[PDB]
Paper text:
To visualize the conformational landscape of dynein activation by LIS1, we incubated full-length human dynein with ATP and LIS1 at room temperature for 5 minutes. We identified three major species: individual dynein motors (Open), Phi, and a third state similar to Phi but with two LIS1 β-propellers bound to dynein, which we termed Pre-Chi. To fully understand dynein’s activation pathway, we began by analyzing particles corresponding to Open. We observed significant conformational and compositional heterogeneity in the Open species and used several approaches to sort out the coexisting subclasses. We obtained six different Open subclasses, which we categorized based on the linker conformation (bent, intermediate, or straight) and the presence or absence of LIS1. In monomeric dynein, LIS1 has been observed bound to both sitering and sitestalk, and to sitering in the absence of binding to sitestalk, but not to sitestalk only.
Cytoplasmic dynein-1 is a conserved, minus-end-directed microtubule motor critical for cell division and long-range intracellular transport in eukaryotic cells. Dynein, a member of the AAA + (ATPase associated with various cellular activities) family, forms a 1.4 MDa dimer composed of two copies each of heavy (HC), intermediate (IC), light intermediate (LIC), and three (TCTEX, LC8, and ROBL) light chains (LC), with the IC, LIC, and LC known as accessory chains. Cellular and structural studies have shown that dynein primarily exists in a pseudo-twofold symmetric, autoinhibited Phi state incompatible with movement along microtubules. LIS1 plays essential roles in the activation of dynein, including relieving autoinhibition and helping assemble the fully active DDA transport complexes.
Author numbering:
A (entry chain A): 2412 to 3156
B (entry chain C): 89 to 297, 307 to 410
C (entry chain A): 3530 to 3689
Write the structure that this text describes.
């Protein structure tokens, strides 16, 4: 190892001294602009680590070829190209595609090093193999197909150019235990890339952490307490994972998010910088230096230009390389979801010729919806490939047991899923009509000679209550069924009468659709008194979900919330009962409430929540529950894993809050899980249409008909689609709607 | 034809109407040819099937009647309502025998074993109570459920009773050991209807897979049968389109009878793991049904205040 | 005026030559109110009409203190136990009122606690002929003749 290190050093010596190549490349990369501010030491340390991994690669090749070791000529040809590759991925890894292309063409212009001959293929699209030649990544990525069982599973990762390049980068970083940051927009694929890289290393265990705005180092201390232990050594106190021989990697998803103090500092970031540079942290229990044996880090963050994020300190960025993952774009997303649609459209063999136009329509609609609803208009108007993954998963779940479906039905389920993913979060009627019209015109453009009236209609509702299959339903029969179910429901849980209308039908269908899937958390935005809690309670009762209310009152400290969470998690994981954790914004008092909600909604487990004899009680209860279920568990790690999996499988959290022009932004800053792991349903205030139907239904059982009624010539109308000529009851319910509107005015 | 192969065919032989509230349970008298139904209008209605005519009015309850049960002779009738009362009726007198109290909530179910020495009932007060026929006293109360018990049904000899709750679990009990034999936590929703296999069905179930054999029907649109000896799901039957509220075994032991919330009644072949005939029962939802051991007649309660009498062939 | 203009525009005739105090309150009940320390103003009489014909339990923003005395004088035959939200002996008085079916008046609603949300929302369970409501950790039967009034002495208070 020392000999091959010396040979590599002697062959890369002419490229380092004075100007050479690295100095000019660095001074050009400084002129280039990046996502994060580029300190020279960060990229230099990144380049040094990648060259060390090159030496390790040569050593492993020598081990794999014991008869013929590494020849000096092939070694020099390999190093002379790995140096260019590493310089490119070090000085351009945190920038955009066009800027890394500019750095590549500048390097090609300036260097006297052999390079592949390509009129337009960038040097960044190449790999220096161990044989010493340039192997393109396009030959490395295959045109694979996935089975119908895993169509949109969280673990399936179809490979692309950017995917395999970031795979190689993350393997190179994690092979020598160096912290790294996966910066990029939400939904870009950073945690998917990290998990797919970690599953190629069987010697590492991943820990998921989600930072909030009110993040303190006590969260990392609790994680270290839960997943590691303190061991006394003659050289000091050493913190090591309990899993012997396994390297623990901590995944922090919101590095940029913790609030910067008034003096420009972040306590968690300074803590991480201290334990990265010095290799340890001070324990406040007895003021003793605690050293880390096998603890590495990986970070994820949105770009600092995002409204809720803060730039990182250069002293922390010095040790930590950052790579910028961008959105896949149209030309890659087309095959990324083309393989998924060709895999899923095998259950119905008569639709296999429509997978390519289906993918084209989905990509076109997603791109043309991305451009309009920017984050400037609303804080939750973020669109990501996570929405397309949920789209194909929903179409697969609707097409799974159906076994027979025409093209009109396929485009109609496409339109319904598009509505559910691109209308629930929307606010205004104008933009809702925009989405509806654009869905219609996209279907018209990409699906010619089809039955438009049969494919597209007004209600487009789908229930699984009238039938086991996920069939479309009609509004009148659905309303009759909901009437009968409410008549049954009044005598069991809540004896409060309700009036039903189309908005209520849509809301209960959406809430049932989100309750049916695992790990389904709601976020209902609307004015108080709109019936969100009652509708959620009715749907949870009809789906067989227990409803939990924390019953907040005076002097509600954090301990009461913690014991409520302990009871909810215990009954949801050990007793194995479906529970609908419904709680309003008024139930939130302190920042610890929202921190625990962030952790539970993100990972499904709260580290440090069960400490002391309650942890032993939880372990005994989980062992008893595993015995009752019929699968044996020993130790404590797999018991905790099974309990966590049960919590994801069972627990559903419903969050209700009033809309606000600053409260929503503050909530998004202080809890990203509410806007990431929860679907945002914007109930809003009751529309004039809803008020009109409520008034017309409620004022129907009393005598209000005058046969001699004169139609006014001016006819002041505030509810659109009013029948002409209106009757007396029509006029008075329109007057009631006008009265409500003038109170608003 | 032979009693083994009595199957219902459309349409219905009789169309009865006149109730002012949805029908809960319609069951067969064991001796004489008189129909009787229980509804939620605080009364019990009496009809006929060989002529399809009104017979007599029984008005003793004050709140919504939930369940009714018969003895072996048919001379005793036990009914339960929402007034936390238990009322007894007779066939030889057609009057009120006794009025009992002690339940803390609505009494969901009552059951009379063929011995007839005492009447067991299940209520919504998280308890199961059995009361004697000579004194009307709750000598022993079965407890151990956490939600309201929906239906209770013992076996043919009364040596082992079973009950269903909302804990996705059916519990079997013994009138001597006073403790649960086995807990059966396999369903995913509320269990509503429980049936017991006759003596003729034991060999059929054994050759399809001793006894006794237990079948449980739940709201999860699935029907499964269970065995006391092994405590394991024998086979899973899937295909009921909506919520299942009533199940019953065939007297021949080869088929089953069940009703669903989709306004249909279906007959299933557990040998072929598939149904063989589906009929549109009523214009609205249905609740329960029953089958006669000898007479070729089958009825089905409903919600639209209509009871339809079907002749098997 | 806006509602009357709209109803005139929509050709729905309404009695213009009437007072909203006189059409809603009878002479005998007006005399009873004036005997029970109510001010003779038409605004105060309209407030009394609202306090009589309420459906949701009302909140009284009365800095002068006369409306509290008017409430205690109007509901004088029925016992009223005056208490405050911040008082430690408030929940016990609430359960006593819920059990015994007598009107209750609570002041200082700026210190509002969400324990009264099931009561204000009428989240009630029907046990046949028995009416049941559950708040906190105890189950209490609800009498039909129970009314609760919230009082305030600060006008410039912001309510969620
Ligand atoms: N190349 C790809 N192949 C398959 N799925 C992809 C690809 N790129 C993105 N995805 C989808 O995007 C999602 C990744 O988003 P995620 O990494 O969770 O973003 P963030 O970590 O910023 O929240 C995954 O659910 C995945 O299905
Ligand atoms: N569609 C409706 N018909 C009748 N009453 C309704 C309807 N929607 C809401 N309500 C009334 O409004 C109240 C809303 O209560 P809740 O849902 O707890 O508050 P929020 O609407 O803020 O979630 C209910 O008590 C109910 O009586």
């Amino acid at each position: 190892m020392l000999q091959i290190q010396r040979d590599a050093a002697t062959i890369m010596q002419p490229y380092f001294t004075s100007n050479g190549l690295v100095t000019k490349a660095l001074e050009h990369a400084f002129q280039l602009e990046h996502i994060m501010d580029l300190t020279r030491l960060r990229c230099l340390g990144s380049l040094f680590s990648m060259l060390h991994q090159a030496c390790r690669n040569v050593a492993q090749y020598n081990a794999n070829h014991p008869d013929f070791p590494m020849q000096i000529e092939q070694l020099e040809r390999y190093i002379q190209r790995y140096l260019v590759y590493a310089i490119l991925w070090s000085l351009s890894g945190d920038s955009r595609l066009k800027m890394r292309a500019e750095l590549g063409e500048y390097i090609r212009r300036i260097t006297t090093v052999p390079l592949p001959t390509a009129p337009n293929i960038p040097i960044i699209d190449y790999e220096v193999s161990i044989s010493g030649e340039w192997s393109p990544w396009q030959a490395k990525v295959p045109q694979i197909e996935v089975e119908t069982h895993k169509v949109a599973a969280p673990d399936v990762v179809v490979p692309t150019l950017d995917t395999v390049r970031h795979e190689a980068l993350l393997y190179t970083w994690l092979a020598e235990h160096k912290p790294l940051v996966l910066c990029g927009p939400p939904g870009s694929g950073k945690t998917m890339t990290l998990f797919s890289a970690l599953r190629a290393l069987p010697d590492m265990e991943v820990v998921g952490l989600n930072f909030s705005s009110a993040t303190t180092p006590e969260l990392l201390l609790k994680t270290f307490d839960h997943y590691c232990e303190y061991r006394r050594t003659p050289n000091g106190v050493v913190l090591a994972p309990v899993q012997l021989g396994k390297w623990l990697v901590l995944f922090c998803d919101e590095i940029n998010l913790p609030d910067m103090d008034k003096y420009g500092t972040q306590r968690v970031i300074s803590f991480i910088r201290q334990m990265v540079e010095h290799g340890g942290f001070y324990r406040t229990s007895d003021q003793t230096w605690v050293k880390l044996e096998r603890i590495q880090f990986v970070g994820a963050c949105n770009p600092p230009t995002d409204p809720g994020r803060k730039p990182l300190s250069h002293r922390f960025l010095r040790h930590v390389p950052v790579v910028y993952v961008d959105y896949p774009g149209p030309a890659s997303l087309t095959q990324i979801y083309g393989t998924f649609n060709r895999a899923m459209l095998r259950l119905i063999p008569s639709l296999r010729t429509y997978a390519e136009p289906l993918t084209a329509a989905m990509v076109e609609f997603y791109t043309m919806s991305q451009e309009r609803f920017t984050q400037d208009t609303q804080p939750h108007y973020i669109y990501s490939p996570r929405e397309m993954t949920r789209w194909v998963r929903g179409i697969f779940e609707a097409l799974r047991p159906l076994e027979t479906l025409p093209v009109e039905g396929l485009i109609r389920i496409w339109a319904h899923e598009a509505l559910r993913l691109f209308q629930d979060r929307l606010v205004e009627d104008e933009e809702r009509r925009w989405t509806d019209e654009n869905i219609d015109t996209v279907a018209l453009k990409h699906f010619p000679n089809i039955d438009r009236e049969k494919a597209m209609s007004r209600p487009i509702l789908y229930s699984n209550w009238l039938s086991k299959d996920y069939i479309p339903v009609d509004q009148e029969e659905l309303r009759d069924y909901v009437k009968a179910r409410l008549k049954v429901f009044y005598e069991e849980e809540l004896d409060v009468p309700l009036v039903l209308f189309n908005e209520v039908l849509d809301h209960v269908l959406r809430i049932d659709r989100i309750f049916r899937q695992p790990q389904g958390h709601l976020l209902l935005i609307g004015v108080s008194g709109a019936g969100k809690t009652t509708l959620s309670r009715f749907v949870a009762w009809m789906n067989g979900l227990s409803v939990y209310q924390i019953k907040v009152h005076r002097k509600y400290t954090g301990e009461d919330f913690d014991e409520d969470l302990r009871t909810v998690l215990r009954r949801s994981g050990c007793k194995n009962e479906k529970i609908a954790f419904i709680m309003d914004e008024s139930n939130v008092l302190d920042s610890g409430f929202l921190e625990r909600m962030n952790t539970l909604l993100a990972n499904g487990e709260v580290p440090g929540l069960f400490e002391g004899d309650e942890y032993a009680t939880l372990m005994t209860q989980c062992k008893e529950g595993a015995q009752k279920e019929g699968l044996m568990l020993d130790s404590h790690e797999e018991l905790y894993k099974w309990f966590t999996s049960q919590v994801i499988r069972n627990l559903h959290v419903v969050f209700t809050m009033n809309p606000s022009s600053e409260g929503l932004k503050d909530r998004a800053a202080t809890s990203p899980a509410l806007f990431n792991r929860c679907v945002l349903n914007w109930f809003g205030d009751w529309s004039t249409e809803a008020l009109y139907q409520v008034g017309k239904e409620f004022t129907s059982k009393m005598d209000l008909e005058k046969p001699n009624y004169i139609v006014p010539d001016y006819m002041p109308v505030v509810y659109d689609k009013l029948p002409q000529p209106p009757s007396h009851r029509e006029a008075i319910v329109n007057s009631c709607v006008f009265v409500h509107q003038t109170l608003h005015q | 034809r032979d009693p083994k192969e009595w199957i219902p065919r459309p349409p219905e032989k009789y169309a009865l109407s006149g109730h002012r509230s949805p029908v809960t349970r319609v069951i067969f008298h064991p001796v004489f040819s008189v129909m009787v139904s229980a509804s939620e209008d605080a009364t019990i209605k009496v009809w006929d099937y060989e002529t399809g005519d009104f017979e007599r009015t029984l008005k003793g309850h004050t709140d919504s009647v939930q369940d009714i049960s018969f003895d072996h002779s048919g001379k005793l009738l036990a009914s339960c309502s929402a007034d936390m009362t238990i009322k007894l009726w007779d066939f030889q007198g057609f009057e009120c025998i006794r009025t009992m109290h002690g339940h803390d909530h609505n009494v969901s179910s009552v059951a009379i074993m063929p011995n007839g020495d005492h009447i067991v009932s299940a209520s919504r007060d998280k308890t199961i109570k059995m009361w004697e026929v000579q004194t009307g006293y709750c000598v022993k109360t079965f407890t151990g459920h956490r939600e309201w018990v929906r239906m209770v049904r013992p076996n043919q000899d009364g040596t082992l009773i079973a009950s269903c709750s909302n804990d996705q679990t059916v519990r079997v009990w013994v009138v001597a050991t006073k403790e649960c034999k086995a807990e059966l936590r396999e369903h995913e929703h509320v269990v509503e209807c429980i049936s017991w296999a006759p003596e003729s069905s034991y060999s059929s179930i054994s050759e399809a897979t001793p006894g006794p054999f237990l079948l449980s029907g739940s709201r999860d649109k699935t029907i499964k049968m269970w065995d006391v000896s092994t405590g394991m799901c024998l086979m899973t039957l899937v295909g009921h389109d909506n919520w299942v509220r009533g199940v019953l075994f065939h007297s021949g032991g080869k088929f089953i009878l069940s009703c669903a919330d989709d306004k249909t009644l279906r007959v299933w072949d557990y040998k072929n793991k598939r149904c063989m005939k589906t009929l549109n029962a009523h214009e609205h939802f249905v609740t329960s049904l029953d089958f006669h051991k000898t007479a070729p007649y089958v009825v089905t309660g409903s919600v639209d205040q209509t009871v339809k009498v079907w002749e098997c062939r | 005026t806006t509602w009357s203009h709209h109803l005139q525009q929509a050709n729905i005739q309404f009695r213009t030559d009437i007072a909203r105090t006189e059409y809603l309150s009878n002479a005998d009940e007006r005399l009873r109110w004036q005997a029970s320390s109510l001010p003779a103003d038409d605004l105060c009489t309209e407030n009394a009409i609202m306090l009589k014909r309420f459906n949701r339990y009302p909140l009284i923003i009365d800095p002068s203190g006369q409306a509290t005395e008017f409430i205690m004088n109007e509901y004088k035959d029925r016992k009223i136990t005056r208490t405050s939200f911040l008082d430690d002996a408030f929940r016990k008085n609430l359960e006593s009122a819920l059990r015994f079916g007598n009107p209750l008046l609570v002041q200082d609603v700026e210190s509002y606690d969400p324990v009264l949300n099931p009561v204000l929302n009428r989240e009630v369970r029907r046990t046949g002929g028995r009416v049941l409501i559950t708040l906190g950790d105890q189950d209490i039967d609800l009498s039909p003749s129970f009314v609760i009034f919230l009082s305030t002495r600060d006008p410039t208070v912001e309510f969620p």
